[PDB]
Design goal:
With 287 residues, this protein is of the alpha+beta class. It has 2 domains: 96 residues, Phosphorylase Kinase, domain 1 (2-Layer Sandwich), CATH 3.30.200; 191 residues, Transferase(Phosphotransferase) domain 1 (Transferase(Phosphotransferase), domain 1, Orthogonal Bundle), CATH 1.10.510.10. It is built from 9 helices and 12 strands. The strands form 4 sheets. It has a 6-stranded mixed beta sheet with strand order 1-5-6-4-3-2, sandwiched between helices. The termini are far apart. It binds the ligand CC(C)N1CCC(c2cc(NC(=O)c3cnn4cccnc34)n(-c3ccc(C4CC4)cc3F)n2)CC1. The site of ligand 4GF has 21 residues, from strand 2 and strand 4. It is found in: Cytoplasm. It is an enzyme of class 2 (transferase). Keywords: Acetylation, ATP-binding, Cytoplasm, Disease variant, Immunity, Innate immunity, Kinase, Magnesium, Nucleotide-binding, Phosphoprotein, Serine/threonine-protein kinase, Transferase. Its main location: cytoplasm.
Length: 287
């Protein structure tokens, strides 16, 4: 590999790390991946500059991201162009993702139009191809969530944030990391397994179908994953949950996606399907 950018070049392209949103004329794009993501124009290309943002742990999150990215190059993974360590903050430089994150697009943040079911199927498929790639290369993401699934100019799914990623090639840890609302029961307990990434992708699929965030304090249920139980203990059905902000979603394909999410969300890690099966089931859904 990557370019080694100076902290000062990245200051100039990001207009001295402007915390102002894009709408007002600033450079801040969003925060939530152990830092703030800014917009910039480096080497004649539009870039995304992640300014990180224990201090020891955060430096290891930086070093792992570059480590994973160096080995891992796929069309469903975000492309890291370079980095900065020389200055007062740790910066990561990526190819700009014009359609931001899946989370933001499912909530229509900034007035973007709702994603069609057709686009939603392509995103689900692409994200599974990116997880498959990581799993085939003995990497466990540890933080699969819609905020970490980025979208390009063609709405191609691009997995990002490999700062918490772990190589294999079942282990345990004292430092439990990830997003609570997406995490597998064993992962919340300290277990490091690719089966936990499958569970997290199951929550993502429920966000795709429903357009609902994994967690909402002002909602019943507060956690999206509880809906699997509401549907099973026939209080409600999947149709009562389908995102109303779509006009092309047929029940057959939606039920087919829920079937995959349901299988992914099995509480027994050993009973969950592997990524290649998830990928296979998602391909059969379209075609
Ligand atoms: C059409 C308009 C309304 N769009 C234009 C695109 C804009 C946008 C662009 C980006 N982000 C990127 O372009 C991006 C590229 N690689 N990368 C790796 C990690 C994180 N972010 C990125 N984010 C973005 C910024 C922060 C995060 C972090 C999870 C918070 C995720 C993101 F996708 N938001 C959002 C507004």
């Amino acid at each position: 590999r990557f370019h080694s950018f100076s902290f000062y070049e990245l200051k100039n392209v990001t207009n001295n790390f402007d915390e102002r949103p894009i709408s007002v004329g600033g450079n801040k794009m969003g925060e939530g991946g152990f830092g703030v993501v800014y917009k910039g124009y480096v080497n004649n290309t539009t870039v995304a500059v992640k300014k990180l943002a224990t201090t020891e742990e955060l430096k290891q999150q930086f070093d792992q991201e570059i480590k994973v990215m160096a080995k891992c190059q796929h069309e469903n993974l975000v492309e890291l162009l370079g980095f900065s360590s020389d200055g007062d903050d740790l910066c990561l430089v990526y190819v700009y993702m014009p359609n931001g994150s899946l989370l933001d697009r499912l909530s229509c943040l900034d007035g973007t139009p709702p994603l069609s079911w057709h686009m939603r199927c392509k995103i689900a498929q692409g994200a599974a191809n990116g997880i498959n790639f990581l799993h085939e290369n003995h990497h466990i993401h540890r933080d699969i969530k819609s905020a970490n699934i980025l979208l390009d100019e063609a709405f191609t799914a691009k997995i990002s944030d490999f700062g918490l990623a772990r190589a294999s090639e079942t282990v345990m840890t004292s430092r439990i990391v990830g997003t609570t609302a997406y995490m597998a029961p064993e992962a919340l307990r300290g277990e490091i397994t690719p089966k936990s990434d499958i569970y997290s992708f199951g929550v993502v699929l429920l966000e795709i179908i429903t357009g609902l965030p994994a967690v909402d304090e002002h909602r019943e249920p507060q956690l999206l994953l509880d809906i699997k139980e509401e549907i099973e203990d026939e209080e409600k059905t999947i149709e009562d949950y389908i995102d109303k902000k779509m006009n092309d979603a047929d029940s057959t394909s939606v039920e087919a996606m829920y079937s995959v999410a349901s299988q992914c969300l099995h509480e027994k890690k050993n009973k969950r399907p592997d990524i290649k099966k998830v990928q296979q089931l998602l391909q059969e859904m379209t075609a």
